[PDB]
Amino acid sequence: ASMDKLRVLYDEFVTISKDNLERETGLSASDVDMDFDLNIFMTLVPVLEKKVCVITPTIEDDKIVTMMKYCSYQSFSFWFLKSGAVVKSVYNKLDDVEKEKFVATFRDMLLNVQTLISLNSMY
Ligand SMILES: [Zn+2]
Ligand SMILES: [Zn+2]
């Protein structure tokens, strides 16, 4: 986990999300606001942990895919209020190989974010 790694992870998340949301829905993505969206993920992590399980590097793929059902794209800068699609809607239309990468990207983003709600509670 690192600030520079998180930027690359977030940009991967947006690139895949954007390409799939655009062709699925016919609507065009908006400009990113990375800090706004990482704020959204910061608020989401505790909800995901209560509704599904604690996020650790060994969390099973099925628990991550279920967390994607509780992540609404309308919450983020690049899809802001455009449709009610959730992250699993993009997952469901990837091929098997692309699916594995998306799960890893979404899990590693949640771990990098969580590594920061952590730093923000240290005195
Ligand atoms: Zn394209
Ligand atoms: Zn901002």
Coordinates of C-alpha atoms and ligand atoms in Angstrom, one line a residue:
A1 CA 0.0 0.0 0.0
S2 CA 1.2 3.5 -1.0
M3 CA -0.2 6.9 -2.3
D4 CA 1.4 6.4 -5.8
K5 CA 0.1 2.7 -6.0
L6 CA -3.4 3.9 -5.0
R7 CA -3.5 6.5 -7.8
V8 CA -2.6 3.8 -10.4
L9 CA -5.2 1.4 -8.9
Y10 CA -7.9 4.1 -9.0
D11 CA -7.0 5.1 -12.6
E12 CA -7.3 1.3 -13.6
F13 CA -10.7 1.1 -11.8
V14 CA -12.0 4.2 -13.7
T15 CA -10.6 3.1 -17.1
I16 CA -12.4 -0.4 -16.9
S17 CA -15.5 1.1 -15.2
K18 CA -15.8 3.9 -17.8
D19 CA -15.3 1.8 -20.9
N20 CA -18.0 -0.7 -19.7
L21 CA -20.5 1.8 -18.4
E22 CA -20.4 3.9 -21.6
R23 CA -21.0 0.9 -24.0
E24 CA -23.6 -0.7 -21.6
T25 CA -25.7 2.4 -21.1
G26 CA -24.8 4.8 -24.1
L27 CA -24.1 7.6 -21.6
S28 CA -20.7 9.4 -21.5
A29 CA -18.5 9.5 -18.3
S30 CA -17.6 12.8 -16.6
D31 CA -14.2 14.1 -15.5
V32 CA -12.7 12.4 -12.5
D33 CA -12.3 14.0 -9.1
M34 CA -10.0 11.5 -7.5
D35 CA -10.1 12.9 -3.9
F36 CA -13.9 13.1 -4.0
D37 CA -14.1 9.4 -5.0
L38 CA -11.5 8.2 -2.5
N39 CA -13.6 10.1 0.1
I40 CA -16.6 8.0 -1.2
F41 CA -14.5 4.7 -0.7
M42 CA -13.4 5.9 2.8
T43 CA -17.2 6.1 3.8
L44 CA -17.9 2.8 2.1
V45 CA -15.2 0.6 3.8
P46 CA -16.9 0.4 7.2
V47 CA -20.3 -0.3 5.6
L48 CA -18.7 -3.1 3.5
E49 CA -17.0 -4.6 6.6
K50 CA -20.3 -4.6 8.6
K51 CA -22.5 -5.9 5.7
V52 CA -19.9 -8.5 4.4
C53 CA -16.6 -9.0 6.3
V54 CA -13.3 -7.3 7.3
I55 CA -11.1 -6.5 4.3
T56 CA -7.7 -8.2 4.5
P57 CA -5.3 -9.3 1.7
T58 CA -6.7 -12.9 2.1
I59 CA -10.4 -11.9 1.7
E60 CA -12.1 -14.5 -0.7
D61 CA -13.0 -13.4 -4.3
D62 CA -16.8 -14.1 -3.5
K63 CA -16.8 -11.6 -0.6
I64 CA -15.2 -8.9 -2.8
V65 CA -17.7 -9.6 -5.6
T66 CA -20.5 -9.2 -3.0
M67 CA -19.0 -5.9 -1.8
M68 CA -19.3 -4.7 -5.5
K69 CA -23.2 -5.0 -5.1
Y70 CA -23.0 -2.3 -2.4
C71 CA -20.9 0.1 -4.5
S72 CA -23.1 2.4 -6.7
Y73 CA -21.3 4.1 -9.7
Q74 CA -23.6 7.1 -9.4
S75 CA -21.6 8.0 -6.2
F76 CA -18.4 8.7 -8.2
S77 CA -17.2 11.8 -10.1
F78 CA -16.9 9.9 -13.4
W79 CA -20.5 8.5 -13.3
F80 CA -22.1 11.2 -11.0
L81 CA -25.9 10.6 -10.8
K82 CA -25.9 9.0 -14.3
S83 CA -27.5 5.6 -13.6
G84 CA -28.1 3.2 -10.7
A85 CA -25.4 0.6 -11.9
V86 CA -23.3 -1.0 -9.2
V87 CA -19.7 -2.2 -9.5
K88 CA -20.8 -5.9 -10.0
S89 CA -22.7 -4.9 -13.2
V90 CA -19.3 -4.2 -14.8
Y91 CA -17.8 -7.3 -13.2
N92 CA -20.6 -9.4 -14.7
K93 CA -19.8 -8.4 -18.3
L94 CA -16.0 -8.9 -18.1
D95 CA -14.5 -12.2 -19.4
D96 CA -12.9 -14.7 -16.9
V97 CA -9.4 -13.2 -17.2
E98 CA -10.6 -9.6 -17.0
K99 CA -12.8 -10.5 -14.0
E100 CA -9.7 -11.8 -12.0
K101 CA -7.9 -8.5 -12.7
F102 CA -11.0 -6.4 -11.7
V103 CA -11.4 -8.3 -8.4
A104 CA -7.7 -7.7 -7.6
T105 CA -7.9 -4.0 -8.6
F106 CA -11.1 -3.4 -6.5
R107 CA -9.7 -5.4 -3.5
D108 CA -6.2 -3.6 -3.6
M109 CA -8.0 -0.2 -3.9
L110 CA -10.1 -1.0 -0.7
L111 CA -6.9 -2.2 1.1
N112 CA -4.9 0.9 0.1
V113 CA -7.9 3.2 1.1
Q114 CA -8.3 1.3 4.5
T115 CA -4.4 1.6 5.1
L116 CA -5.4 5.5 5.3
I117 CA -8.5 5.5 7.5
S118 CA -5.9 3.7 9.7
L119 CA -3.3 6.5 9.4
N120 CA -6.0 9.2 10.1
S121 CA -6.6 7.6 13.6
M122 CA -3.0 7.6 14.8
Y123 CA -1.8 10.0 17.6
Ligands
ZN1 ZN -13.7 2.2 -25.5
ZN2 ZN -11.5 17.0 -5.5

